[PDB]
């Protein structure tokens, strides 16, 4: 009966991975270009509204967000495979992400992020680089994700 996502630590692992995802893509030069948009979710939080939102209402923002991201990483790993010279370093991180989201998308489905989604209630950004994909990555993770799980973890 574990709603695992709640154990602060269990989640912290990913946030800290992305910190590494970033910390590497920065020292990255031209070999971090995507050569394509790659639509990622909007990671900016405005507390004077979020605080005003409701779990359920946030949840969606998150579920949809996670999804879209997950589509990206794949699309990233992808464009990265067929690549001639796949910056090995980049490789690994691109992968951990792929899996991280997989495990996460699950732990959320737990809390009820999906059920609290397709419930008819009452953005575009694009990474032309990896350096940014990861930036946008963690920013959503520790950003909106981390901020939701909390209130929702009761």
């Amino acid at each position: 009966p574990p709603r695992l996502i709640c154990d602060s630590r269990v989640l912290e692992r990913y946030l800290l991975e992305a910190k590494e995802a970033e910390k590497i893509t920065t020292g990255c030069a031209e070999h971090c270009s995507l050569n394509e948009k790659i639509t990622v979710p909007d990671t900016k939080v405005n507390f004077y509204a979020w605080k005003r939102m409701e779990v359920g209402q946030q949840a969606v923002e998150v579920w949809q967000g996670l999804a879209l991201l997950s589509e990206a990483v794949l699309r990233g790993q992808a464009l990265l495979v067929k690549s001639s010279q796949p910056w090995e370093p980049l490789q690994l991180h691109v992968d951990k992400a792929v899996s991280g989201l997989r495990s996460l998308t699950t732990l959320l489905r737990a809390l009820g992020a999906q059920k609290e989604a397709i419930s008819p209630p009452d953005r575009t950004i694009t990474a032309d680089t990896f350096r940014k994909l990861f930036r946008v990555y963690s920013n959503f993770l520790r950003g909106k994700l981390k901020l939701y799980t909390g209130e929702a973890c009761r």
Binding site: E12, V45, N46, F47, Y48, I125, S138
Partner: protein, 218 residues
Amino acid sequence: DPKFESKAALLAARGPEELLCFTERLEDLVCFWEEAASAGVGPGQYSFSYQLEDEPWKLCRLHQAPTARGAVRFWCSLPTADTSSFVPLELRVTAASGAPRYHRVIHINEVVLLDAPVGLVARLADESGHVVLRWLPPPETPMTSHIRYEVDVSAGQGAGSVQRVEILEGRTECVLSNLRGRTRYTFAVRARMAEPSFGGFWSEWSEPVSLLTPSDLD
């Protein structure tokens, strides 16, 4: 406008010759800098522009003020609207001549400088060297749960005394241990935002609360 001087002055010292930004309720940003200036100084000097990654560069209305030190201080207070946390915010401070004065990139959620906790109250705990500290998170503050504290204990300047210990996130209480019998201590507390979703600067110490140990000895 008041306590601002406090924090601003607080930060200053820590890092003087640069550009300093910080936030409070996280629903606000304020940056600034203090330069000594005699034959010249005034707003009709610098231009302040910033931008939220993926959003149109903008300019900020810079303000000025005299310093207790006789120097000047230019600050900017992003319009509440543009206080988006979790999204690269780039800043460029330029002189009218057009020279590159200040340049930096930050995350609002990464420069929070809370006030100082309130209601600290440490009383004896019958057993040996054991003290019970209690307090309250900074007033009008978001995400308590994410604030981690840090207590200080000293035997007063009556023995070159100190001792620092950190607390778990969101934990407003601490039970000390191993304190010399018969002595006038002084418990202080600090505030801060936990990483990796936040972070910033160490808060100013709270109003101290002293106490004297009995004689739990041999």
